[PDB]
Amino acid sequence: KLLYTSANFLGIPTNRGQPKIGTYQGPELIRKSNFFQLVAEDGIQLTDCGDIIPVELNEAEDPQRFGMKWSRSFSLTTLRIAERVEELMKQSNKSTPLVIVGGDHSMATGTILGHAEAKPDLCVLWIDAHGDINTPLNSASGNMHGMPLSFLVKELQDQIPWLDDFEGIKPCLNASNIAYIGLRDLDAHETHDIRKHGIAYFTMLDVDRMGIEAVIKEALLAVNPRLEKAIHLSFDIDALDPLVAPSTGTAVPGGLTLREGLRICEEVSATGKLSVVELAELNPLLGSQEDVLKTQSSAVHILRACLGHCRSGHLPFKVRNLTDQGIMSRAAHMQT
Amino acid sequence: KLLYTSANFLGIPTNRGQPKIGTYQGPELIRKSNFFQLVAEDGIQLTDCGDIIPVELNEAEDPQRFGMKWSRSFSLTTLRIAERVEELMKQSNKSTPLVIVGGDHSMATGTILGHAEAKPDLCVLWIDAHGDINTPLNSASGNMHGMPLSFLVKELQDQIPWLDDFEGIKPCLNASNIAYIGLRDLDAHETHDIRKHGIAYFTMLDVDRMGIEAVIKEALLAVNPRLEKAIHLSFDIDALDPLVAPSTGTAVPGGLTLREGLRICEEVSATGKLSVVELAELNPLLGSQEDVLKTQSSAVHILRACLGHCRSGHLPFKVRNLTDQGIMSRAAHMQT
Amino acid sequence: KLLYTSANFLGIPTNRGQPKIGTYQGPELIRKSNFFQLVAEDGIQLTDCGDIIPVELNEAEDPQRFGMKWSRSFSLTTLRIAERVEELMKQSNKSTPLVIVGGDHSMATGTILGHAEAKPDLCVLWIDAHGDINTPLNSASGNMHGMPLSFLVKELQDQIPWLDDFEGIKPCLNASNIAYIGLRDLDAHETHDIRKHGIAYFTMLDVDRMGIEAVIKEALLAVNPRLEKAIHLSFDIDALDPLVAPSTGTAVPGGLTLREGLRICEEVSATGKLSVVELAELNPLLGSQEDVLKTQSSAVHILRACLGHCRSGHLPFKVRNLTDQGIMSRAAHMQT
Numbered sequence A, B, C: 001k002l003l004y005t006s007a008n009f010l011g012i013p014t015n016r017g018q019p020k021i022g023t024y025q026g027p028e029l030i031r032k033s034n035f036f037q038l039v040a041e042d043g044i045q046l047t048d049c050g051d052i053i054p055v056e057l058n059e060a061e062d063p064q065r066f067g068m069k070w071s072r073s074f075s076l077t078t079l080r081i082a083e084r085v086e087e088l089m090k091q092s093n094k095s096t097p098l099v100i101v102g103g104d105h106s107m108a109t110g111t112i113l114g115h116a117e118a119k120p121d122l123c124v125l126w127i128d129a130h131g132d133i134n135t136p137l138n139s140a141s142g143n144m145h146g147m148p149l150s151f152l153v154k155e156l157q158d159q160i161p162w163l164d165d166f167e168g169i170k171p172c173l174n175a176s177n178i179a180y181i182g183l184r185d186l187d188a189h190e191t192h193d194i195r196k197h198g199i200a201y202f203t204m205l206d207v208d209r210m211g212i213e214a215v216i217k218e219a220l221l222a223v224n225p226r227l228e229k230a231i232h233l234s235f236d237i238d239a240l241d242p243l244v245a246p247s248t249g250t251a252v253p254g255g256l257t258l259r260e261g262l263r264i265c266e267e268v269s270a271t272g273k274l275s276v277v278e279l280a281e282l283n284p285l286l287g288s289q290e291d292v293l294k295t296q297s298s299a300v301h302i303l304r305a306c307l308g309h310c311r312s313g314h315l316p317f318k319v320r321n322l323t324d325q326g327i328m329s330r331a332a333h334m335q336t
């Protein structure tokens, strides 16, 4: 009656992937909400596996390299994340989905690396306003949260500078294993690489012309045609329109409505193949108090959908009956 | 040229159906707006029939019974409402629609009861994020605004505790006479009853997959196949997304857009069978000043649509002409 | 690779077309944004042609005439605008689109007049919540921004009072050359004239039932069947929902989403016939600081789309390569 009867929860408070302080508070924004309560009420046993501690070096230990900011903090954090995620997914080897709350999106290199160690044939559904696939020398910002996929994609490795501390970050994805939904702010070099290597992608223009139902179907067709593969769902909260998720560092107008976001998560959940979902780029230090509440609320609804919550309702585990209590009903009285 | 040339307006400031003070100010939020002016400008004669005075007992006179809060205030108020609504609909027996502004949604038991006395074969279109069909012993809150339909539905009467003061509240609806649109927060026991008794329902998931045009058509097909029946349109303002109706007590993200709400009302109005429309759960004491204005504005647009306002425009009652005023036009001058 | 490789930019700070001070700051709201930077980054050469100075007479020199407010300021401003626009379009005779930022919508009489002098067979796509086609004696407000099209439409000239200072304002449009998208607040006499003279129009009701993709196709079919005609795109920011463009003087709920607005502009741009786009009714003096930022942001996204910005990405002008820098890649290292 439930596709997933248990799940794990993990916080990853990355904040060295981008300059705005506050993504480290993402996991707590969700712990402080009613998310856990709501999940239990649907009958799912959710275990809080705690937080990963990111490695945050000082400036002297972690100077710019190839224009990257905090690259050694990134490589060390990536390996720590991957080890923990691999551990969790293998103890789990009705499957047990891992729910990850960030943290800026640079965490994805580690979560996918570790996940792929447990499930080498996985596919990735990347829900984001951005491509997050800049190679280091094409990045205008040097911000790691804009590069996480590039280190993972085999076809891109002639464009990644070699670094000794990156050796353990082994590319584990083929371009054919990734699909994007929600794109609306690609850098020119990302567009070039995505098209050159045939990465499946559905931008907001595609969502407008095709409708979200067809986009979801086509994205799943592209990377998981017969639902044979485990799914890594990487959901950047900034994929959603700023009107519903204002508290995030790189907001872009004209995004997915909450309902469109829910449909993506509902369909992914219903495949029975949801293996990891991560939710990135929440920043409770951005915007007004009401902004933060709106963002928290959207995130909670999204994560609930991923775990199988149905907007059309759920049936009670036990159906209550008046007579059992020794109470007289209207119908009964009307007989007398 | 108009489907309805006159209408009645009635306030019902119920506030004992739920804990948040302020729904009693709903009717005044609409009187203070330009609603009456706008309706007259479309050529409709709208008569303000005043307010019903709810019965509000003190705690000593109205203790909890079967976990219900303010249940005797409810039964007495229900009967007072029904008497007044029946009176209005029978003096009205181009039909004359009654527009009712609440007030929390507990008023619906009385409005439908009285309406059905005048028109026994009516159907109900219930636009709401919530089912409002909890039976008393399944209600977690004890709030009457979450139970109004259960006392009316014949099939549910073996689940309603008998109470002497409820005797005059006679179930007047079959499950086959009700259709929901907009649902997204059903309690488990509501889901059970709705499915068990075959109540037609279209949740936000249905709206997403089918589109609002198909949902409206299917809802009308389910309960009013050949437009033979009078329609009771019960519209909870919280059916609309919180972004357009923030000032309401149980807001739920991912609701109907204003345009989707307008389409429901436009199609219902155009059947020629709109007999009662009630608008529930406005609370001007919730949210910011701008929040209240947004909510007031949405409500006004909704009610105008119900009465036949057309977004594609209306023709003038008398067409003005330059010559009649003894004024020289450009065209005329250009001849000389 | 680009449909338009250069464009001109012109400010028109009209504020005598309506009573609310602040539309004169519209052009500066756009100059202060990153619009110019973003346009250059797409490879378009955009030349700032400065501002037109409106003629603003004092009350004594410009009394009401036929109920019109500031009508002589309007006629003189109209002729000044037309002269400048004609000049620009003829020096331009890959075409070079002119981008105009207002300023209240009364400027349209002049921009279209001047544009038509350069391109007599043009068509007009009018994106607006309002018809802006009231003739003077039917206008309840006397506000010129509600009348700009009436002076231009040949079929309406028997309803325009003759005024000596209006002689040079020659009607240059047939009713068959105009299509509206986005309408939701037509005055009765506008509805009469639009229907009587067969002006193509798609209201928000049409957008709801047909979808924006079909509306755009039908609007272009109506006035530019084989893409033979130059297009004058007149975009009132109030066509967009108040949730995304709050800072404007006559806001109406239930408007186009930003995405729907983008689709209109993308399709118009892609015809290769975009000759003038004007963006009207920005008022930075209305609403909160965040309101103004939202409005500025929507306007920038809209104007970028008009010039050919693609949400699905653009290719780099030069593709960067690691080796050129004498840098060692991961792929290369892995061979050694």
Ligand SMILES: NCCC[C@H](N)C(=O)O
Residues within 6 Å of the ligand: A105, A130, A131, A132, A134, A139, A140, A141, A142, A143, A145, A146, A147, A187, A250
């Ligand atoms: N995660 C936001 C990424 C923004 C930009 N593409 C970058 O590379 O920084």
Ligand SMILES: NCCC[C@H](N)C(=O)O
Residues within 6 Å of the ligand: B105, B130, B131, B132, B134, B139, B140, B141, B142, B143, B145, B146, B147, B187, B250
């Ligand atoms: N009207 C809101 C109802 C919320 C909940 N279903 C309840 O029974 O109270």
Ligand SMILES: NCCC[C@H](N)C(=O)O
Residues within 6 Å of the ligand: C105, C130, C131, C132, C134, C139, C140, C141, C142, C143, C145, C146, C147, C187, C250
């Ligand atoms: N531009 C807003 C126009 C509003 C009204 N139709 C008028 O004629 O003033």
Ligand SMILES: [Mn+2]
Residues within 6 Å of the ligand: A128, A129, A130, A236, A238, A239, A250
């Ligand atoms: Mn992003």
Ligand SMILES: [Mn+2]
Residues within 6 Å of the ligand: A105, A128, A130, A132, A145, A236, A280, A281
């Ligand atoms: Mn991202």
Ligand SMILES: [Mn+2]
Residues within 6 Å of the ligand: B128, B129, B130, B236, B238, B239, B250
């Ligand atoms: Mn409700």
Ligand SMILES: [Mn+2]
Residues within 6 Å of the ligand: B105, B128, B130, B132, B145, B236, B280, B281
């Ligand atoms: Mn309700």
Ligand SMILES: [Mn+2]
Residues within 6 Å of the ligand: C128, C129, C130, C236, C238, C239, C250
């Ligand atoms: Mn307008």
Ligand SMILES: [Mn+2]
Residues within 6 Å of the ligand: C105, C128, C130, C132, C145, C236, C280, C281
């Ligand atoms: Mn306008």
